[PDB]
Design an enzyme around this catalytic site. Structure first.
Site, PDB file in Angstrom:
ATOM      1  N   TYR A 162       1.028  -1.334   0.209  1.00 48.02           N
ATOM      2  CA  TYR A 162       0.082  -0.098  -0.068  1.00 48.02           C
ATOM      3  C   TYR A 162       0.965   1.403  -0.567  1.00 48.02           C
ATOM      4  CZ  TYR A 162      -4.305  -2.716   1.471  1.00 48.02           C
ATOM      5  OH  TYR A 162      -5.209  -3.258   1.249  1.00 48.02           O
ATOM      6  N   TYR A 198      -2.339  -8.980   0.156  1.00 50.16           N
ATOM      7  CA  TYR A 198      -1.348  -8.840   1.474  1.00 50.16           C
ATOM      8  C   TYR A 198      -0.884 -10.121   2.200  1.00 50.16           C
ATOM      9  CZ  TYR A 198       0.662  -6.270   5.748  1.00 50.16           C
ATOM     10  OH  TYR A 198       1.079  -5.995   6.577  1.00 50.16           O
ATOM     11  N   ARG A 219      -3.606 -12.284   3.386  1.00 52.76           N
ATOM     12  CA  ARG A 219      -5.063 -12.255   3.137  1.00 52.76           C
ATOM     13  C   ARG A 219      -5.886 -11.853   1.861  1.00 52.76           C
ATOM     14  NH1 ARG A 219      -7.386  -6.841   4.989  1.00 52.76           N
ATOM     15  NH2 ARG A 219      -9.350  -8.627   5.347  1.00 52.76           N
ATOM     16  N   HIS A 222      -8.370  -7.360  -1.957  1.00 55.66           N
ATOM     17  CA  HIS A 222      -9.557  -7.134  -1.726  1.00 55.66           C
ATOM     18  C   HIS A 222      -9.063  -5.451  -2.023  1.00 55.66           C
ATOM     19  CE1 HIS A 222      -6.159  -6.965   1.319  1.00 55.66           C
ATOM     20  NE2 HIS A 222      -6.904  -5.624   2.359  1.00 55.66           N
ATOM     21  N   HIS A 224     -10.864  -1.877   0.187  1.00 55.37           N
ATOM     22  CA  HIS A 224     -11.099  -0.958   1.086  1.00 55.37           C
ATOM     23  C   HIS A 224     -12.672  -0.625   0.623  1.00 55.37           C
ATOM     24  CE1 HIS A 224      -8.757  -3.079   3.554  1.00 55.37           C
ATOM     25  NE2 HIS A 224      -8.034  -2.763   2.920  1.00 55.37           N
TER      26      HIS A 224
HETATM   27  C1  LIG Z   1      -5.243  -6.368   8.949  1.00 56.06           C
HETATM   28  C2  LIG Z   1      -5.050  -5.785   7.463  1.00 56.06           C
HETATM   29  C3  LIG Z   1      -3.806  -6.396   7.229  1.00 56.06           C
HETATM   30  C4  LIG Z   1      -3.558  -5.697   5.625  1.00 56.06           C
HETATM   31  C5  LIG Z   1      -4.736  -5.550   4.886  1.00 56.06           C
HETATM   32  O1  LIG Z   1      -4.219  -5.159   4.161  1.00 56.06           O
HETATM   33  C6  LIG Z   1      -6.254  -4.519   5.635  1.00 56.06           C
HETATM   34  O2  LIG Z   1      -6.676  -4.401   4.029  1.00 56.06           O
HETATM   35  C7  LIG Z   1      -6.018  -5.190   6.338  1.00 56.06           C
HETATM   36 FE   LIG Z   2      -6.228  -3.933   3.292  1.00 57.67          FE
END
Ligand SMILES: Cc1ccc(O)c(O)c1
Ligand SMILES: [Fe+3]
Ligand SMILES: CCCCCCCCCCCCCCC(=O)OC[C@H](COP(=O)(O)OCC[N+](C)(C)C)OC(=O)CCCCCCCCC
Ligand SMILES: CCCCCCCCCCCCCCC(=O)OC[C@H](COP(=O)(O)OCC[N+](C)(C)C)OC(=O)CCCCCCCCC
Ligand SMILES: Cc1ccc(O)c(O)c1
Ligand SMILES: [Fe+3]
Lengths: 309, 309
Positions: A162, A198, A219, A222, A224
């Protein structure tokens, strides 16, 4: 050898918690007293040795030194648990959550560029980037398209990094982070790239603890969302790219039915021109429905520390 | 809202703790499962809101970022609690502890110069230092003087700072830190200066939390000891300078009866000349009595991360 339930220890717990002290914040004292009691008791019940205890204290130092408390938190389920509580409370108030909430995560950054109806989110600096057209309609509590709603979107690049938290230092501020105000038809639309999943810093304290639990720190890919509008509660959610190996095995337990979305691949020249892009791209559609304020109050907005640039 | 007791939350806690995972460390999983369960339940009983929760997470990052977890630990009574457990265990074994144990504190540094029977501990760099002659005898478990015992002493200067942890710029390495091997008569003698009490960094996270409990972050003037010798357990203790305002109101709860010692002031020329010092000085005598190993082992030594130089 058991001393927790002796007067000496119980009296000591009140002293350490400042319960009989005149100054301070009674709410903090109340919480501290409960937490300390629970931990003192757990040390006795599980027979935690001093060597074990100090290893725990050392871990805490490095957890914070690496600024990872907000990363371990979701990994240990707190974030999702807090969402379960909000859901329960909404159910109690008779509030039907058309679009389900899920965790915010610790990577939101305030201050992103804002535009109306459309925005390109990336700067094309990602080699392996696959064009994604994500669009949808925002509906008010009555089911009608809602113009002027503020849709905030943030996601990772193809490396799973990110902006503002990229170790490679490769990204410009707010890359893949935008605020889009919905147009007259209550729609938003962005051109970005398909994010990659991630993974927790492999050398960091969060992943090391997860290794001790026999767990991974991944993860699925996704995106947000924050959606806010006058007269409505602020919606925090995310969508999952269908097909990801970790869709139902997210270390942060954020997946929910209704939030898994299919990325349709487009290859014919007709579609490419209609969305004027340079070639084959992916398309995702996702509408979100907001809930009205409860007697003029957003009973579920969360005020937590968030990076602002 | 009461959902802690539902099957969804209980199963979730097992998943998050890796209880259903095959890899990992069973001991760590056991501890994590208990701590998470207690915290999830505490959040429900105390109705901790998301806003409160995230302030707690932020505090944890700040605690570790400032490397103060080992300073907060004693402030919340853990260090003293662990000693209470050790005392209880010794009491059950019929081990009468002649010299009371007390907390180590987080400022021990390994590798101090070593000498037999005598050493001057300070470098005279403290403008307001008042000369202190500290001496005593080390006794074995039978009440007999013990030559060759290793006495480790470390303490603060008149500003409450320790070498290697001095916020105002380095002191000579190992300033006010020495190891003394007892002589033929089981005695140790050092020339140093009277320490001043220690106070937690005022703007640091430990003091910030203590403020919320209506508590101060002060420790009375004290001197730390490690005493080890063959056939005996390693003794960790400290002495308090009598008369200090915080003698019985230590934020780390380490003071004990039998560990408060008077520093006698000498101003007469005969005393001065005899102990060969350059002017008035203070004198403290403190003897330590050791305990024997338990079935050939030191059942109470603590292995914890300590700075080494
Ligand atoms: C807890 C967490 C860690 C990485 C991410 O990209 C996220 O959306 C949430
Ligand atoms: Fe995230
Ligand atoms: C300021 C007040 C704070 C109070 C906090 C009290 C918490 C209670 C303490 C529990 C401590 C658990 C002890 C875990 C442990 O005994 O060892 C944990 C591992 C160690 O690895 P090993 O391979 O076993 O080391 C040994 C290798 N040898 C065998 C070769 C030597 O390391 C780890 O980081 C795991 C530990 C993380 C636990 C943190 C829980 C808190 C999270 C919310
Ligand atoms: C990753 C898993 C970890 C999970 C940890 C869960 C922790 C449990 C929940 C903690 C709840 C704490 C609630 C504290 C709180 O609601 O407010 C705390 C104070 C705030 O003071 P105010 O004056 O209200 O600030 C506002 C001033 N204004 C109004 C002018 C802006 O600030 C503080 O730092 C006090 C913080 C104490 C918490 C430390 C816990 C550690 C115990 C070992
Ligand atoms: C908790 C603590 C703080 C300062 C000290 O000098 C000490 O021995 C212990
Ligand atoms: Fe000290």
């Amino acid at each position: 050898v058991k001393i927790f339930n002796t007067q000496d220890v119980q009296d000591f717990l009140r002293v350490a918690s400042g319960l009989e002290q005149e100054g301070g914040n009674p709410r903090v004292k109340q919480i501290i007293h409960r937490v300390l009691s629970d931990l003192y008791k757990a040390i006795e019940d599980l027979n935690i040795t001093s060597d074990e205890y100090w290893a725990g204290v050392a871990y805490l130092n490095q957890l914070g030194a690496n600024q990872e408390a907000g990363l371990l938190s979701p990994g240990l389920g707190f974030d999702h648990y807090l969402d379960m509580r909000m859901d329960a409370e909404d159910a109690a108030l008779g509030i039907e959550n058309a679009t389900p909430r899920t965790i915010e995560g610790p990577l939101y950054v305030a201050g992103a560029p804002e535009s109306v109806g459309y925005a390109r989110m990336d700067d094309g600096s990602d080699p392996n980037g696959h064009t994604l057209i994500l669009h949808g309609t925002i509906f008010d509590a009555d089911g009608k398209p809602l113009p002027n709603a503020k849709v905030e979107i943030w996601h990772a690049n193809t490396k799973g990094f990110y902006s503002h938290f990229d170790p490679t230092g490769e990204q410009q501020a707010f890359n893949m982070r935008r605020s889009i105000i919905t147009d007259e038809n209550g729609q938003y639309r962005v051109r970005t790239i398909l994010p990659a999943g991630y993974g927790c810093p492999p050398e960091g304290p969060t992943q090391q603890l997860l290794n001790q639990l026999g767990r991974h720190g991944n993860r699925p890919a996704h995106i947000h969302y924050f959606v806010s509008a006058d007269g409505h509660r602020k919606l925090t959610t995310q969508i999952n790219v269908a097909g990801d190996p970790y869709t139902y095995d997210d270390f942060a337990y954020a997946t929910r039915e209704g939030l898994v979305v299919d990325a349709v691949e487009h290859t014919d020249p007709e579609a490419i021109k209609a969305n004027d892009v340079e070639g084959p791209f992916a398309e995702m559609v996702f509408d979100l429905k907001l809930t009205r304020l409860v007697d003029g109050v957003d009973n579920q907005v969360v005020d937590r520390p968030r990076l602002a640039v």
